[PDB]
Point group: C5
Chain length 211, copies 5
C-alpha cells in the first residue's frame, strides 16, 4: 500500500465530522484567520453595498487528525477533501450575497494536527457609504468574521499574521480600478447580547478612497 | 474514546431524522422563535416588495436527543450538523426569494433535549407599500412564520422572548440606511381554511418610516 | 421503542422510491391537485411573461405506505421527508423560471396510503398578454399541470375540490396589488402528439383585470 | 412481491451507472434525438443572444437494462429515476446559460433495453443576429447537440423522426410572440480538430422572421 | 461479465478520491492544460469585467488508475464519472462568477493512467479595460490558471500544445461579434508570497481589438 493511502485510511477510518475536534471539550478551538483584498469589483452608493473579492485563509488544530510521520514514509503534510472533516462555522456578518464564492474541495493538513484552509470570497457587504465628498470621497466599510453559532468557549478567532503586516497588505491588490485600498485594519471584540453568551469576532476595516 | 465522540455515537447511532422527535405522538412539538432585524437592504415600491436581513433563531425539544451529563464527562451541550436531526418546516409566507440565505451547518443541543438553531434570513417579502406620503412615508410590512405542512396538533409556534422586549429591539440594527425601524410587533393567530385543519403562525409587523 | 419510530421503520425499511407505488402495474396512479393564487407579483407585457405566487397542494395513493393504526398506537397520520418516497413528476408547462420555489422537506401520510404534499410555487409563465385595452386591460393567462413523462395510463390528474369552489377562490389572495383576480378556471384535456401516447393535463386559466 | 418491485430489483441490483451500457465496448452507443421549439422568449440583438424554450427528447439502448416481460407479469415498460442509470453527455454548444432548465427525475424504459428521456431546455444561445433588415428582419440561429466528451466511436447522434417532419414542426409552438418560426433544419456533421478524434454533432437551424 | 464492468470494478473497488494519485508522495502531479476561446459574450468597461466562453481541457496521470489492456479485452480507454476520482483544484484567479459553467459528468481515461478532462468555462474575469481608444480600442485581459491550494511540489501546470499553436488558435472562435481575437499568449510563472511556498500558474493573455 502507498503511504498516502495508508495515512488517509488511518486518519479517516476512525474519525467523524459532526463533533468539534478536541480531546477535551473544556478547551476552545482557536482559529487563526487572515484576509487579503484582491479587488474591489463594485461600490454601490445607491444600495449602500460594496463587493470585495478577498482571498481568505484560516487554520486550526484538529487534535484527532495527527500522526507520526516516520510511520507513514515521513509524510509531513497531505491534502484531503474539506467535506470529510470538521470545519468551523466562521461566517462574515453584514453580508448580503455569498453564493458567488465557489467551494474549495481540498484543505492542507500537517502531522501536528494543524488544518489549513484557503478559500476565495466574493462577498457583497452592506455598510454605510456617504457621497458627501464624491469627487474626493473616502469610504470606511467593515468586514467582521465570527463563529456564527459557537461561543468563545468553543471557537475563538485570532490573526494569522501580525496586525501591522496585514494592515498595509497591497501585494496582490488589483490597483487599476476606480478605488484605491489604503489599509485593512483588524480589530478583535467580544460580542455578547445575552447575559451568559459571549461570541468572538474579528472586524476588518477596509479603507478606500476614490480616484 | 473522547467524551464528545462517545456522546455523538450514543445519540446518533439510534436516531433517525424522518420522524417528529416526541416519545408520544399525541403531544405537539412546541417551537419558540425570535426575530431580530439586522438591516433593511431595499424597499421597492414599484414591485411592492422589500428585502430584510433578519437574524432568526429558534429552539425546540428533541425527546430522543437527551442524556445524563455525568455519564459523558459532564457535557451539558454540544454542536452537531443540522442535517443529522429533525428540523421543523417553519417557513415564512409572503416570501418571494429566499435562496440568498446560506444553510448553517451546526446547531446547539443541550442534555435536556433542547435544540437551538441560529440562522440568517435574506428573505424578500411581498407586501402592500403605498407611496401616498412619500416625503414622510411610513410603511407597515408583515412577516409571518408558520409550520408550512404540520398542523397545530403537530407543531406550534411561540415566542422566545417577551413580546415587549422584541417589540423595541434595535440593538443590532444598521441604523444608517434610508429607513428607520420603529418596532417589530409580534402576533399569534390560528390559521384554518379547511373544516378540520388548524395551523399556528406568528406574524411580525416591521414598522418603518423614511428619513 | 416509540410508536413513531416503529412505524417509520416498518414503512421505509422495505420500501424504495424508484418505482411507481402500485401493487399492480396495470392501474394508473391518480393524482388530485389544487391551486390557490396567493399573489401576482409581476405582469410583464414587454417580455410577455407574468409571475404568480400560488399555493399548490396535491395528494395521491401509495399502496405500499399503508398500515393498521391499532398496531402502531392508533397513529392515523405522520410526516416523513418528501425525498424518501416516490413523488409524481407533475410539472407546469409554459414555465420560464421555477428556481425561486423552495423544496418543502416533509409530506403528510395517512394509514390508508394517501400522501399529501403541500408546496409553494414561484413560477413565472410565458403567455400572450395584449396591451390593447391598457387603461382597463383584462388578461387571460393559463397554467397547465401535467405528468411531464408518465402517460395517462401511468399518472392521471384530477381536482381536489369541486371546479366551482376553486373557480371563485379569493380567500388568501393579496388583494392590494395592481391586478385583481376574477377567477381560476380549471380544465382537463388529454394531450397526445404521437399515435399511441396520451398525456393528462389540467389547465388553470387565471383571469385578471387591471385597476 | 409486486411485479414492479421485482423488476426494479432485478435491474438495479446488478447495475452501475459509471460505465457505458454496452455488452461489447467495440460498438458505439447510438443516440436518437428530437427537438421541438415551444416558444422563443427573447431575441437580444444587443448581446447577440436569443432564448429558446424547446422540448427535447432522446432515446438510446441500454444493453444491460433488458428483461423478458413474461417473467415480470408482462411488464413492457416502466419508469425509474434518471440518476440511477447511465445518461449520455449530449450537450448543446454555443450555449450561454442552462441553469433555468429543471432536472426531470424519471425516464421511461422498455424491455428491449431502450431508454426514453424527455426533458425541457431553457437554453440561451449566442449566435450572429444582424439588424440590417430590422422592420422585416429574418434571423438564422443554430443549435448543435454533441457528445461533449465521447467520440463518435463511443456516442453517435441520430434523428428520432424524419428530417422533413421535424423541419416543419409548429404543432406546439407559441405562435403569438414577436417572432414566427419558419423551420427547424437539422444537419449532421463529424467534428474533428485533433488528428485522431472525431465527434458527432447535429445542428438545428432555427429560422425566424419578425412580425 | 462484460469487459467494461470488470475493468470498472478492478479500478474503482480499490481506489479512493481523497488522496493525490501518486505511488510516491515525493513527486509532483504534473497537469497539462489547454485553452480555446469559443466566444467573447460581453466586455464591460463600466464594471471592468469581460465574459469569455472558453473550451478548457486538461490531462494528468493517475498512477493508480492503470491496467494492462490484454487482461480486459484490449480496452485501451474508457469513461467514468469525474466525481469518482481525484481531480486537481486548478482554478482561474481574477474570476468574478463561474456558476454558469455546468459540471461535466464523465472524463476519459487510458490504460497508461492518463486522465483527460474536457469541460466548458463561462468564467467572467475582472481586468483593466481602458476606453482611451474607444473607436479603435484594443484590450489586453489575462486568464491565470493555478492550483489554488497545492504548491508546485504537489501540482504543476504545463501546456498541452506548443505555445505558438495555441497563440494563433482561431479554429472555433465565433468571429461574428463586436470583438476580434488577435491571440492567446500563454506564460508560466512561479507565484510565491510566503518564504517557503511556491505555486505554479499559467497566464493566458487574450488580446482583442474592437471592430
Ligand atoms: C481569544 O483570542 C483573542 C485573540 O487571540 C484573545 O485576546 C488576546 O489575549 C491575549 C492573552 O490573554 C492578550 O495578550 C491580548 O491582548 C488579547 N487581545 C489580542 C487582540 O490579542 C482572547 O484572550 C482569547 N480568548 C479565549 C477565551 O481564548
Ligand atoms: C475607519 O474606521 C476605523 C474604525 O473606526 C478607524 O480606526 C480607528 O481610528 C481611530 C482614529 O482616532 C483610532 O483611534 C483607532 O485606534 C482605530 N481603530 C483601529 C481598530 O484601527 C479608521 O481610522 C477609519 N479610517 C478613516 C480613514 O476614517
Ligand atoms: C400554541 O402556542 C400558543 C402560544 O404559546 C398558545 O397560545 C397561548 O396559550 C396560553 C395558554 O393556553 C395562553 O395563556 C395565551 O394567552 C395564548 N396566547 C399567547 C399569545 O400566548 C396556544 O394555546 C398553543 N396551542 C397549542 C395547541 O399548543
Ligand atoms: C402596523 O400594523 C399593525 C397590525 O395591524 C398595527 O398593530 C395594531 O395596532 C392597533 C392600533 O389600534 C392595535 O389596536 C393593535 O393591538 C395592534 N396589533 C398588534 C399585534 O400590535 C400597528 O399599529 C401598525 N403600525 C402603524 C404605524 O400603523
Ligand atoms: C383521468 O381523470 C379524469 C378526471 O378525473 C377523468 O375524466 C373524468 O372521468 C369521469 C369518469 O369517466 C367522467 O365522469 C368525467 O366527466 C371526466 N371528466 C372530468 C373533468 O371529470 C378520466 O376519465 C381519467 N382517465 C383515466 C384513464 O383514468
Ligand atoms: C379566458 O379563457 C378561458 C378559456 O378560453 C375562457 O373560458 C371559456 O369561456 C368560454 C366563453 O364562451 C366558455 O364557453 C368555456 O366553457 C370556458 N371554458 C372554461 C374551461 O371555463 C374564459 O371565459 C376567458 N376569460 C375571459 C375574461 O375572456
Ligand atoms: C452516426 O450516425 C449518422 C446518422 O445516423 C450516420 O450517418 C448516416 O449513415 C448512414 C449509413 O452509413 C447513411 O446512409 C447516411 O447517409 C448517413 N447520414 C445521415 C444524415 O443519416 C453515421 O454513419 C454514423 N456513424 C457511426 C460511426 O455510427
Ligand atoms: C439558414 O442557414 C441554413 C444553413 O446555412 C440554410 O440551410 C441551407 O440552405 C442552403 C440554401 O442554398 C441549402 O443549399 C442547404 O442545403 C441548406 N442546409 C440545410 C442543412 O438545410 C438555410 O437556408 C438558412 N435560412 C435562411 C432563411 O437563410
Ligand atoms: C513545472 O512545469 C514547468 C513547465 O512545464 C517547468 O518549467 C520548464 O522546465 C523545463 C525543464 O526544467 C525547462 O526546459 C523550461 O524552460 C521551463 N519552462 C517552460 C515554460 O517550459 C518547471 O520546471 C516545472 N517545475 C517542477 C517543479 O516540476
Ligand atoms: C498584452 O500583454 C502581454 C503581456 O504583457 C504582452 O506580451 C508581451 O509583449 C512584450 C512586448 O514587448 C514581449 O516582450 C513579451 O515577450 C510578451 N510576453 C508574452 C508572454 O507573450 C502582449 O504583447 C500584449 N499585447 C498587446 C496588444 O499589447
Ligand atoms: C437578545 C439577543 C440575543 C442574541 C442575539 S445574536 C443572534 C441572534 C439570532 C441569530 C443569530 C445570532 N448571532 C449569534 C452569534 N453569531 C452572530 C449571530 C441578538 C442579536 C439578540
Ligand atoms: C381550501 C384551502 C385549503 C387549505 C389552504 S392552505 C395551503 C394550501 C396549499 C398549499 C399550502 C397551504 N398552506 C398550509 C399551511 N401552511 C401554509 C400554507 C387554502 C389556502 C385553501
Ligand atoms: C412529435 C411529438 C411527439 C411528442 C411531443 S411531447 C414532448 C416532446 C419532447 C419532450 C417532452 C414532451 N412532453 C411529453 C408529455 N409531457 C409534456 C412534454 C411533441 C411536442 C411532438
Ligand atoms: C486543438 C483542439 C483540439 C480539440 C478541440 S475540441 C474541445 C476542446 C476543449 C474542450 C472541449 C472540446 N470539445 C470536444 C468535443 N465536444 C465539444 C467540445 C479544439 C477546439 C481544439
Ligand atoms: C502573505 C500572503 C501569503 C499567501 C498569499 S496567497 C493566498 C492567500 C489566501 C488564500 C489563497 C491564496 N492563494 C494561494 C495559491 N493559489 C492562489 C491563492 C498571499 C496573497 C499573501
Ligand atoms: C525519515 O526521516 C528520518 C530522519 O531524517 C530518516 O532517518 C529516515 O531514513 C527517513 N525515512 C524515509 C523512508 O525516508
Ligand atoms: C461532574 O460534576 C459533578 C458535580 O459537580 C462532580 O462531582 C464530578 O466530579 C464531575 N466529573 C467530572 C469528570 O468533571
Ligand atoms: C386505539 O383505538 C381503539 C378504538 O378506539 C381503542 O379501543 C384502543 O384502546 C386504542 N389504543 C390506544 C393505545 O390508544
Ligand atoms: C402474458 O401475456 C401472454 C401472451 O399474451 C399470456 O399468455 C399470459 O397469460 C400473460 N400473463 C399475464 C400474467 O398477464
Ligand atoms: C488483443 O490484442 C492482441 C494484439 O493485437 C491480440 O493478439 C489479441 O488476440 C487481442 N485480443 C482480443 C480479445 O481482441
Amino acid at each position: 500500500r502507498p503511504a498516502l493511502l495508508r495515512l488517509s485510511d488511518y486518519l479517516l477510518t476512525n474519525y467523524r465530522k459532526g463533533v468539534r475536534p478536541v480531546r477535551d471539550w473544556r478547551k476552545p478551538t482557536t482559529v487563526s484567520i487572515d484576509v487579503i483584498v484582491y479587488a474591489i469589483l463594485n461600490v454601490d452608493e445607491k444600495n449602500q453595498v460594496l463587493t470585495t473579492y478577498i482571498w481568505y485563509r484560516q487554520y486550526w488544530t484538529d487534535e484527532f487528525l495527527q500522526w507520526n510521520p516516520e510511520d507513514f514514509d515521513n509524510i509531513t503534510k497531505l491534502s484531503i477533501p474539506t467535506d470529510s472533516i470538521w470545519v468551523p462555522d466562521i461566517l462574515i456578518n453584514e453580508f448580503v450575497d455569498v453564493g458567488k464564492s465557489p467551494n474549495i474541495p481540498y484543505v492542507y493538513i500537517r502531522h501536528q494536527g494543524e488544518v489549513q484552509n484557503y478559500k476565495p470570497l466574493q462577498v457583497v457587504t452592506a455598510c454605510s457609504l456617504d457621497i458627501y465628498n464624491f469627487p474626493f470621497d473616502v469610504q470606511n466599510c467593515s468586514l467582521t468574521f465570527t463563529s456564527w453559532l459557537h461561543t468563545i468557549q468553543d471557537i475563538n478567532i485570532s490573526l494569522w499574521r501580525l496586525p501591522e503586516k496585514v494592515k498595509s497588505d497591497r501585494s496582490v491588490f488589483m490597483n487599476q480600478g476606480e478605488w484605491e485600498l489604503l489599509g485593512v485594519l483588524p480589530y478583535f471584540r467580544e460580542f455578547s447580547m445575552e447575559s451568559s453568551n459571549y461570541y468572538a469576532e474579528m472586524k476588518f476595516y477596509v479603507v478606500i478612497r476614490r480616484r
